[PDB]
């Protein structure tokens, strides 16, 4: 608790965070989410194939 | 110094050393059809970093 500030984000906060600063951990590398294929190749097996699916 | 079939007749115990690589022609080995059939296609496209707009 003394080292963090936390709270309950809303839909707008989630959207801004994923769209402006969203980076994926693809092959242990910090890759910017500039395409939906990067999400699909790592999370498609779970039904997540786009930025919108990730945000949802 | 002997052949690889004969031992040396003037050294009483000596024979020529053996090759650990019979065919040293890397170009012909790699261009041989039996090597080429087993290979996956080359990935010759360079994927430079994408500026995160």
């Amino acid at each position: 608790e003394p080292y963090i500030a936390w709270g309950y984000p809303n839909l707008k906060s989630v959207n801004e965070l994923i769209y402006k600063r969203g980076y994926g951990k693809i092959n242990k590398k910090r890759i910017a989410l500039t395409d939906n294929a990067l999400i699909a190749r790592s999370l498609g097996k779970y039904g997540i194939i786009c930025m919108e699916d990730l945000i949802h | 110094y002997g052949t690889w079939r004969k031992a040396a007749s003037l050294k009483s115990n000596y024979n020529l050393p053996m090759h650990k690589m019979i065919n040293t022609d890397l170009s012909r080995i790699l261009k041989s059809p039996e090597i080429q059939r087993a290979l996956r296609a080359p990935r010759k496209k360079i994927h430079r970093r994408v500026l995160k707009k």
């Binding site: - | 110094y1 050294k11 000596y14 020529l16 050393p17």
Partner: protein, 52 residues
């Protein structure tokens, strides 16, 4: 004076090195890379008659 100036090498390794040197002396690229000016020698394993 007892610095151990001398080294002993295995006889098999010494023969190996002799074989390697002889084999290299028959390749024109290596003899040229030793700078020996063989551009008009008729045949690199150059053998002459016993009259010499």
């Amino acid at each position: 004076t007892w610095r151990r100036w001398h080294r002993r090498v295995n006889t098999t390794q010494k023969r190996y090195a002799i074989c390697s040197a002889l084999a290299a002396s028959a390749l024109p690229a290596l003899v040229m890379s030793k700078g020996h000016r063989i551009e008009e020698v008729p045949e690199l394993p150059l053998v002459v008659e016993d009259k010499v």
